[PDB]
From Swiss-Prot, chain C:
Segments passing through the bilayer: 8-28, 89-109, 119-139, 157-177
Species annotation: Mus musculus (Mouse)
Organism placement in taxonomy: Eukaryota, Metazoa, Chordata, Craniata, Vertebrata
Domain of life: Eukaryota
Function (record text): Regulates the trafficking and gating properties of AMPA-selective glutamate receptors (AMPARs). Promotes their targeting to the cell membrane and synapses and modulates their gating properties by slowing their rates of activation, deactivation and desensitization. Does not show subunit-specific AMPA receptor regulation and regulates all AMPAR subunits. Thought to stabilize the calcium channel in an inactivated (closed) state.
Protein name per the record: Voltage-dependent calcium channel gamma-2 subunit
GO BP annotations listed: eye blink reflex; membrane depolarization; membrane hyperpolarization; nervous system process; neuromuscular junction development; neurotransmitter receptor localization to postsynaptic specialization membrane; positive regulation of protein localization to basolateral plasma membrane; postsynaptic neurotransmitter receptor diffusion trapping
Similarity remark: Belongs to the PMP-22/EMP/MP20 family. CACNG subfamily.
Swiss-Prot record, chain D:
Residues of the full protein shown: 594 to 692 of 883
Cytoplasmic domain ranges by topology: 18-23
Intramembrane stretches listed in the entry: 1-14, 15-17
Record lipid sites (S-palmitoyl cysteine): 17
Induction: Down-regulated in the pyramidal cell layer of CA1 in the hippocampus by global ischemia.
Subunit structure: Homotetramer or heterotetramer of pore-forming glutamate receptor subunits. Tetramers may be formed by the dimerization of dimers. May interact with MPP4. Forms a ternary complex with GRIP1 and CSPG4. Interacts with ATAD1 in an ATP-dependent manner. ATAD1-catalyzed ATP hydrolysis disrupts binding to ATAD1 and to GRIP1 and leads to AMPAR complex disassembly. Interacts with GRIP2. Interacts with GRIP1. Interacts with NSF via its C-terminus. Interacts with CACNG2, PICK1 and GRIP2. Interacts with GRIA1 and SYNDIG1. Part of a complex containing GRIA2, NSF and NAPA and/or NAPB.
Protein name in the entry: Glutamate receptor 2
Organism: Rattus norvegicus (Rat)
């Protein structure tokens, strides 16, 4: 609307300037301000560029002065608003740590409908994670998601307005899969692990434990991780 | 407890009003000058 | 920009077109497309006097603008009071319509008693003043409205009427200038 | 051609000009050039204001492979310990390069 | 003295309608109430008080 009214004001100012400059037969001219020349002078004045001619009559100079003031205000407003836009975009910082996510509230975030994540959130004593669990508990609409597939689909559709919380392994797997739209960001909130499980009181426990430790020290475990998380 | 935009025409409406007022004032001045000069010419002739 | 009769006809049709466009725009309630109530929120088309429902449960069952709403209007400053009063009265669009009609009457009467050249000058002044008052009316309307939406065809009809009025005023002033140049040429000889 | 270059240079720096176009095509060129100059100068001023308003310190290294590729920044581990042993019997390309 | 001589009557029957009128009046009404209830209502949706 501002641009529309600027064009209308330009047309009106040019027409009025031409009229007040050439309508009087007693000034017949002493001024080279035709309709085309009036339009040219107005266009030059708006762009704050040097004009070849300037009005000499009282009405012409009044029109020129008010057009100059309008042009100054509009150009300064445009520069100031563009500076504000650029500064606001520059100040925008994504979220890395979970604390930054906790302080912020623009982007929604929630965990699965069930699982050990819920128990970790509830039983935690960290102030950040406590307020996190309160925020999920009291939130509308339900950030809670039935399954992991629905969670990743929702995160993909929400175009950054949603965040998901899940195992780092599955998160890395989803990151390394097409179409490469999601990223794991930050550090692991807690510590867990996957271990080989054997029946109580079995002869297979001690040497499987020795085997997995030897495998980790030999580094082949990291090779398997890289091989199917990044290589494939 | 559970608890920049583009400049609009209203932000610069005053300068538009001032511009139109200046245009009208210049027009009135020009018309008065024309009428006065026509009256002077008629008095001369 | 050439001859006089063709210019006369062009100016007459331009003035009539501008006046017709504005008389349509003032009397047409299609100025903004926006969400609102015309009696839940639904998309409606509003004008200067009545806002009217679109794709609603009751299409065409539609109502005047709440220019001075009750139920805690919250009041405002004197400048805002004059703003809302001018918007509600819509004094400037009607003033531009009146000025366009006066200019049309002036150009029509210029044919009778062709020796009074000031009539066409008055017509040009009236047309350009109508254009300026149209600028004021458009500005005040947009300012009052913004106190997702689109502008209907009547708003652009008014804008085109302003443009045509300014063009007709420029042509009339050129006509006046040509007439005085002709008088000077015939007096010199 | 020299005068046209001078006029365009003066218009871009918003320093006016002694002479101005008079034809329709020349004035169209002048108008579009003036609009371009206005937009570009306003954009430059706004972006410089944004740069001076917000300070964005950026670390050169964000991952170990960045250290592997780069050479200006040195890095090392303990002369004898778990880290040096880990980099010792590692067949990964990146860790081998760090060795 | 202003309270007893204010029209329309500014007193409210119960805190619920007082908060409702505060939210509806759009900055044209203030409610004088206990700070605990004030803090509780402040931390409730939709953060209009």
């Amino acid at each position: 609307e501002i641009w529309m009214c600027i064009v209308f004001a330009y047309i009106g100012v040019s027409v009025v300037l031409f009229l007040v400059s050439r309508f009087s037969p007693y000034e017949w001219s002493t001024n080279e301000f035709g309709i085309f020349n009036s339009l040219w002078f107005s266009l030059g004045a708006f762009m704050q560029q040097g004009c070849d001619i300037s009005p000499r009559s009282l009405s012409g100079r009044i029109v020129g002065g008010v057009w100059w003031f309008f042009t100054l205000i509009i150009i300064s407003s445009y520069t100031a608003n563009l500076a504000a836009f650029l500064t606001v975009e520059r100040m925008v910082s994504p979220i890395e740590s979970a604390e930054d996510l906790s302080k912020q509230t623009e982007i929604a975030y929630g965990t699965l409908d069930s699982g050990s994540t819920k128990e970790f959130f509830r039983r935690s004593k960290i102030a950040v994670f406590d307020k996190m669990w309160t925020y999920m508990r009291s939130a509308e609409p339900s950030v809670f998601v039935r399954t992991t597939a629905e969670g990743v689909a929702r995160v993909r559709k929400s175009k950054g307005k949603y965040a998901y919380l899940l195992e780092s392994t599955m998160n890395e797997y989803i990151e390394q899969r097409k179409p490469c739209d999601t990223m794991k960001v930050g550090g692991n909130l807690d510590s867990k692990g996957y271990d080989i499980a054997t029946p109580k009181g079995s002869s297979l426990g001690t040497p499987v434990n020795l085997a997995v430790l030897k495998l980790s020290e030999q580094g082949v475990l990291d090779k398997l991780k890289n091989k199917w998380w990044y290589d494939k | 407890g559970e608890c920049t935009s583009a400049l609009s025409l209203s932000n610069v409406a005053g300068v538009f009003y001032i511009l139109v007022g200046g245009l009208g004032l210049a027009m009135l001045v020009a018309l008065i000058e024309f009428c006065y000069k026509s009256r002077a010419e008629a008095k001369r002739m | 920009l050439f001859d006089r009769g063709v210019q006369m006809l062009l100016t007459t049709v331009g003035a009539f077109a501008a006046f017709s466009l504005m008389t349509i725009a003032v009397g047409t309630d299609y100025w903004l497309y926006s969400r609102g109530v015309c009696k839940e929120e639904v998309m409606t088309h509003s004008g200067l006097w009545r806002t009217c429902c679109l794709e609603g449960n009751f299409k065409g069952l539609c109502k005047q603008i709440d220019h001075f709403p009750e139920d805690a209007d919250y009041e405002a400053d004197t400048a805002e009071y004059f703003l809302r009063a001018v918007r509600a009265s819509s004094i400037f669009p009607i003033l531009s319509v009146i000025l366009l009609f006066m200019g049309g009457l002036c150009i029509a009467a210029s044919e009778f008693y062709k020796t009074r050249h000031n009539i066409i000058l008055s017509a040009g002044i009236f047309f350009v003043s109508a254009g300026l008052s149209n600028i004021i009316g458009i500005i005040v309307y947009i300012s009052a409205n913004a106190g997702s939406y689109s502008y209907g065809w009547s708003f652009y009809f008014g804008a085109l009427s302003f443009i045509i009025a300014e063009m007709v005023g420029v042509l009339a002033v050129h006509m006046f200038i040509d007439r005085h140049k002709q008088l000077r040429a015939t007096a010199r000889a």
